[PDB]
Enzyme design. Sequence first.
Site, short mmCIF file in Angstrom:
data_model
loop_
_atom_site.label_atom_id
_atom_site.label_comp_id
_atom_site.label_asym_id
_atom_site.label_seq_id
_atom_site.Cartn_x
_atom_site.Cartn_y
_atom_site.Cartn_z
N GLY A 12 91.58 -3.02 63.28
CA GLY A 12 90.59 -2.09 63.78
C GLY A 12 89.38 -2.75 64.42
CG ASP A 13 86.00 -1.86 63.66
OD1 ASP A 13 86.13 -0.65 63.97
OD2 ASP A 13 85.60 -2.20 62.54
N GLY A 15 87.67 -2.80 69.80
CA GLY A 15 86.98 -2.32 70.98
C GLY A 15 87.80 -1.30 71.73
CE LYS A 16 90.93 1.55 67.42
NZ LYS A 16 90.03 0.49 66.88
N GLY A 40 85.06 4.33 64.07
CA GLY A 40 83.74 4.18 64.66
C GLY A 40 83.98 3.45 65.96
CG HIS A 41 86.67 4.50 68.36
ND1 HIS A 41 87.79 5.12 68.86
CD2 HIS A 41 87.05 3.99 67.16
CE1 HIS A 41 88.79 5.01 68.01
NE2 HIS A 41 88.37 4.33 66.96
CD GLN A 224 91.34 4.26 61.21
OE1 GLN A 224 92.07 5.24 61.25
NE2 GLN A 224 90.08 4.29 61.66
N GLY A 302 78.41 0.26 58.34
CA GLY A 302 77.38 -0.75 58.45
C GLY A 302 77.71 -2.02 57.68
#
Lengths: 431, 431
Positions: A12-13, A15-16, A40-41, A224, A302
């Site tokens: 995940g994360d 940068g989708k 969280g995109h 994800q 966070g």
Amino acid sequence: GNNVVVLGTQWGDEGKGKIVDLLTERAKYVVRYQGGHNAGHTLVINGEKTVLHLIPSGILRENVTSIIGNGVVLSPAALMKEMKELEDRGIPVRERLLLSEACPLILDYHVALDNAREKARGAKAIGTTGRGIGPAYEDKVARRGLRVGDLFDKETFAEKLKEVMEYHNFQLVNYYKAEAVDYQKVLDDTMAVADILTSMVVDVSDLLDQARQRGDFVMFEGAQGTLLDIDHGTYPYVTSSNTTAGGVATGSGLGPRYVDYVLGILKAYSTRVGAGPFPTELFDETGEFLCKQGNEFGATTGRRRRTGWLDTVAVRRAVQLNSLSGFCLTKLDVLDGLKEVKLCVAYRMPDGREVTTTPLAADDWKGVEPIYETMPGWSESTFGVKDRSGLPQAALNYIKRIEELTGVPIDIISTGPDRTETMILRDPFDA
Amino acid sequence: GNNVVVLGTQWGDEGKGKIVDLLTERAKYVVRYQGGHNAGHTLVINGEKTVLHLIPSGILRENVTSIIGNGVVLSPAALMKEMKELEDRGIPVRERLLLSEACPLILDYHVALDNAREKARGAKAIGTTGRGIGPAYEDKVARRGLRVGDLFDKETFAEKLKEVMEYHNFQLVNYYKAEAVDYQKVLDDTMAVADILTSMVVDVSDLLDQARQRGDFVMFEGAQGTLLDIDHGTYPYVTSSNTTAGGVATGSGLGPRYVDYVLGILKAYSTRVGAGPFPTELFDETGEFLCKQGNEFGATTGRRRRTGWLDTVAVRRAVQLNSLSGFCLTKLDVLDGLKEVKLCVAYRMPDGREVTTTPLAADDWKGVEPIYETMPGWSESTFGVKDRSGLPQAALNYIKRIEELTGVPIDIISTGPDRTETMILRDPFDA
Ligand SMILES: O=C(O)[C@@H](CCCN1C(=O)N[C@@]2(O[C@H](COP(=O)(O)O)[C@@H](O)[C@H]2O)C1=O)N(O)CO
Ligand SMILES: O=C(O)[C@@H](CCCN1C(=O)N[C@@]2(O[C@H](COP(=O)(O)O)[C@@H](O)[C@H]2O)C1=O)N(O)CO
Ligand SMILES: Nc1nc2c(ncn2[C@@H]2O[C@H](COP(=O)(O)OP(=O)(O)O)[C@@H](O)[C@H]2O)c(=O)[nH]1
Ligand SMILES: Nc1nc2c(ncn2[C@@H]2O[C@H](COP(=O)(O)OP(=O)(O)O)[C@@H](O)[C@H]2O)c(=O)[nH]1
Ligand SMILES: [Mg+2]
Ligand SMILES: [Mg+2]
């Protein structure tokens, strides 16, 4: 290709969100098909930063209709909060957002159950995002969960909710020994928005079949990453939905044979937030560098994300599970200044064997050691570079190597967070 | 096509087992990707009847390697019992069966939970097959379930099982007020076969990627039917897995873009066993005729299956969800002797509207009325006919009509239960 899928090849994360927004310029539809608000995109347009969670990343374009597919577990409260914030920023959400009546609902008790199970786990805690995602998917499978379509008849919804919360409170109070969730608050909060949600309902699978026949461009936005897949990921340190390409069909209703191109989002290094096996994880100076330079902190919680070198072995698993057509390499710019960069090319098993495939369940990962391949870094700054001719040779050899190890081309390279700090070598819609 | 999928377009029992066995003559692999032992696929070779539940329908062919994919929820007890019965009949099961270490395990408590939830439902009972399928899928999603790979370390498995049953007994005893499941019996029964199961373990997704690159023929055998899908079916009267084509990728690890041809099994009329909406259901003389003439009784529970006319509206939903390439019409022979046959061509909604699409959730089906299209039957016997030239014109017009309404061709027509009582107009492997 008309039907393009954008998903995370790692944890995940990758940068989708950025890539979806960038590529939606040519799409008529953008669809979320799994997960919920744990996603969280982050999008950055001309320096303006938007962080979506439940709402599809094509919501800032008036030419695209965002659709929340049936695979998504919807939190009425999470949606409202996001709809509002966006509407305050000149985005007419309600005018361009549609959703499935089949989406399961995430209610207050799901979050209560989430925090409770996690505390009961103790040191074996998953480190979930605490959004009630797991409990919602569980109620779905058990066939006792409530869906958006239930809001259409307020009386029977109250009766159904009555039954489900009776069951959920017994365990929360008696077993987990926590606070009971008040039925009336949930009932009131839900009904207060019941009409807003239902006004956005559409038959997603039929609509997607219509779009397909017309030959419209449709983009699927994954949440994800591959290794967080409920079936194929590092169980039980995974998310409760299928984050792999197969989730596109089950989570939206589009037939598998209509997926034309699967774009795998690949970060230049690796990150993972939450518990679970992570072979190439760095605990040294270079780890802190990647975290700081890449500002690796949870877009939803966070939490400081764990960093490490790119894992070619794990990525190859991703290539295979998703039938990837190409990659989009992101955060290449974060690697700037490093004297050397490493690529995990194989695993040293606890029994001495050197393997090139990944273990399945999290327990089978214990003891695994990465086998690196060191390459020279680059001093030149690649940040913002929008053409290959701006990338230092070392950076180019690095791109080539990843392609060589993987067997999948890198069609897009992202050199910064802004929508424009990118270089499309090949557009998936034209592929 | 090399990778062929065979699934049910209706509510299961369309005759998938027969078709898989028939078509595996040319396959190297046959894979089950969802469901468990609630499936009952009947094969009849030269009059010999075999009913498989968990084991893939290609197990009678020495040229094919059967594989139980990760999507399947495995009952160690159910497997053993079936392996034995087959081995007694000259089928060297262990020599040709492979399975995933990712498959969740169905244990005694899952069945206990199944019967309990069902009784707690009362008149709202799903009418499950009582095999613990739902509870197993639930434990998977909640990330607390045990998988085959857990059997590899006996001590930690005992500790894990210890935790899970503590949780499961509390609710069975305290909430459902039923009998607790003895931890030691489950632990003993499981370990007694732990080694047999683990000896059959293989990395399914990697193997399927190997087969794909070599261009081997692989057949995917579906369980249940499209309308029993957990997401898109008549919720909550559904099964707990994705019975649609997307389940192939999530349940086996094969990338979606590698599915080449999806064959939809279509019965000449309709059947459904268990609770749930069924528009074309017959409660008259013709219903009893279809049941008797078609010997419609549960291949797993022995329950009398509900019969009705073929529902074109519901089937069209199936065409779309699975991206069907073609159909295989079965039990045409059962319609012999009827003066007239009907095809539901549209639905009359409770509000007066005439629709051609199906409602989603079970509640949205209440009040729906079928709109028929009556066609002349045939006196001629079609049983055993192995060529179109043996089918009466009326039978041919019936085939054509279904093709017309649906837009999908009928590539195979089955005129009897035996493997040879069939006519392949087109082989999916060549398509
Ligand atoms: O927790 C955050 O702030 C991360 C979430 C990254 C993706 N991700 C999830 O959405 N859930 C994660 O998957 C696991 C299961 O948690 P959950 O059930 O809440 O999805 C946890 O490790 C949790 O961290 C997981 O890794 N954000 O950077 C996402 O934008
Ligand atoms: O129950 C039987 O004997 C049927 C099963 C038909 C397919 N089928 C299932 O396997 N399960 C069913 O799906 C629903 C959910 O039950 P379960 O969770 O056990 O799968 C029930 O209606 C149950 O009947 C369902 O319809 N056999 O004819 C199958 O060979
Ligand atoms: N430096 C840099 N940051 C990027 C790039 N692409 C995306 N990002 C940032 O990386 C983060 C990606 O994580 P996240 O927002 O969770 O993305 P998603 O969940 O994969 O869509 C975001 O903060 C982006 O602004 C890139 O090419 N370079
Ligand atoms: N008369 C007749 N029976 C058939 C035909 N094809 C299959 N059958 C029988 O129909 C039943 C199919 O239901 P089931 O065994 O549950 O099949 P599955 O679960 O779909 O594989 C079996 O008893 C078969 O022997 C056919 O063409 N004609
Ligand atoms: Mg994120
Ligand atoms: Mg059956």
